[PDB]
Amino acid sequence: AQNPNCNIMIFHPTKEEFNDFDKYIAYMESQGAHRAGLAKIIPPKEWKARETYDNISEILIATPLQQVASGRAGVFTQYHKKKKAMTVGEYRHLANSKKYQTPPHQNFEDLERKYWKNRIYNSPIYGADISGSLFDENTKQWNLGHLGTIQDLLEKECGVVIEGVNTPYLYFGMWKTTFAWHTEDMDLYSINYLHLGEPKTWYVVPPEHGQRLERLARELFPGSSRGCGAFLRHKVALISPTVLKENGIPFNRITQEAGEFMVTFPYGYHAGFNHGFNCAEAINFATPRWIDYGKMASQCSCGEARVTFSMDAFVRILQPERYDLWKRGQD
């Protein structure tokens, strides 16, 4: 069995190997990458996502989210308070302001310590989930707006044609902006490219151990757990590495820098934080190996998780028994 300790693997494809996305994902899995839940891909030196980032300031962040925490330093939830619209240029200035800027630090480890110590005492503002792309249309390799669609994958694997579309999302972050513990909708893959700026630290639980994280989360968030049998789908709960280690939960951590891709694998729980002003782009995708995960994915039916139009068909076709209850949650 490849990668039996479920370590995060890092890949350095050549320009020739960067041509065929599906084939490279399958190669990474042949080496056991999926066992970690997360892999890093460093593009060949010949590649670029676009020529410059000098002309992005007029992109609008229509609903910036202020991430307000409740709980204790290592075990907290966050809620998202909607703020007034601002441009990316306005947001970058805000991120660099004395109130919100990254503190002085020695190295990534020192900054990670400061994050876990102090996150709950601040409420950083995240420009998340903005439909759009920063890949140049002429970038032919690993262009996240030109991937094969999940609807086409389901059709190719299972023969059923379904409605829905699959497009990327931009994330503009600042120091302490936070992504809560989650897997993807329908336990899909994700791919995330850090276009610019400061790093993003990731934590991940191997898929084979995801239920260990769920059991801890039910212990640590007991009212949430009573409210919903899949409350990590709400994407609001954080648990620190110190707390995970105290409870024996297997996990790994890695820092993504600008110019690097991360891939999350089906049912790989992940969480993390941004080091300072940055911009990432991400999209979900599928492979043949995903289908069995999609069929088994938990679902939130309490009404909190509210998701895209396109998840309807996935539930309807892969999870027909759950469909009626899940759709009630959506309406």
Ligand X SMILES: O=C(O)CNC(=O)C(=O)O
Residue numbers in the known binding site for Fe cation are 182, 184, 270
Instruction: Using DSSP, state whether 179 is helix, strand or coil.
Output: strand
Q: How many residues bind Zn ion (CB under 5 A)?
A: 4
In this complex, which beta carbon is closest to ligand X, that of residue 196 or of residue 316? 196
Q: Is the dihedral of CA 156, 185, 170, 217 positive or negative?
A: negative
- Identify residue 18 by its one-letter amino acid code: F
Contacts of 305 by beta carbon, 8 Å cutoff, 6+ apart: 230, 233, 234, 235, 299, 329
d(CA 108, CA 144): 28
Residue nearest to Ni ion (CB): 190
Q: Which of 91, 115, 135, 171 binds ligand X (CB under 6 A)?
A: 171
Burial 150-187 (b: 16+ CB within 10 A, else e): bbebbeeeeeeebeeebebbbbbbbbbbbbbbbbbbbb
Q: Which of 77, 133, 166, 192 binds ligand X (CB under 6 A)?
A: 192
Stretch that binds Zn ion, among 80-88, 116-124, 207-215, 301-309 (CB under 5 A): 301-309
In this complex, which beta carbon is closest to Zn ion, that of residue 28 or of residue 302? 302
Q: C-alpha distances in angstroms, 118 versus 69, 76, 122, 176, 330?
A: 11, 12, 7, 9, 36
Binding mask 41-60 for Mg ion (x = CB under 5 A): ---------------x-xx-
d(CA 79, CA 170): 20
The binder of 275, among ligand X, Zn ion, Mg ion, none, by C-beta within 5 to 8 A per type, is none
The binder of 300, among Ni ion, Mg ion, Zn ion, none, by C-beta within 5 to 8 A per type, is Zn ion
Q: How many residues bind ligand X (CB under 6 A)?
A: 9
Q: Which of 25, 154, 204, 280 binds ligand X (CB under 6 A)?
A: 280
Q: Which of residues 220-259 bind ligand X (CB under 6 A)?
A: none
166 binds ligand X (CB under 6 A): no
For the chain, first and last CA: distance in Å?
44
Stretch that binds Zn ion, among 70-78, 215-223, 227-235, 283-291 (CB under 5 A): 227-235
Stretch that binds Zn ion, among 50-58, 164-172, 282-290, 297-305 (CB under 5 A): 297-305
DSSP H/E element including 127: strand 125-131
In this complex, which beta carbon is closest to ligand X, that of residue 81 or of residue 156? 81
**Plot region of 139 (φ>0 → left; ψ -120 to 50 → alpha; else → beta):** beta
Q: Where do we find the tokens 């297997």? A: 250
The binder of 216, among Ni ion, Mg ion, Zn ion, none, by C-beta within 5 to 8 A per type, is none
| Residues of this chain that bind Mg ion (CB under 5 A) | 56, 58-59
| Residues of this chain that bind Zn ion (CB under 5 A) | 228, 300, 302, 304
| Residues of this chain that bind ligand X (CB under 6 A) | 171, 179, 190, 192, 200, 264, 270, 280, 282
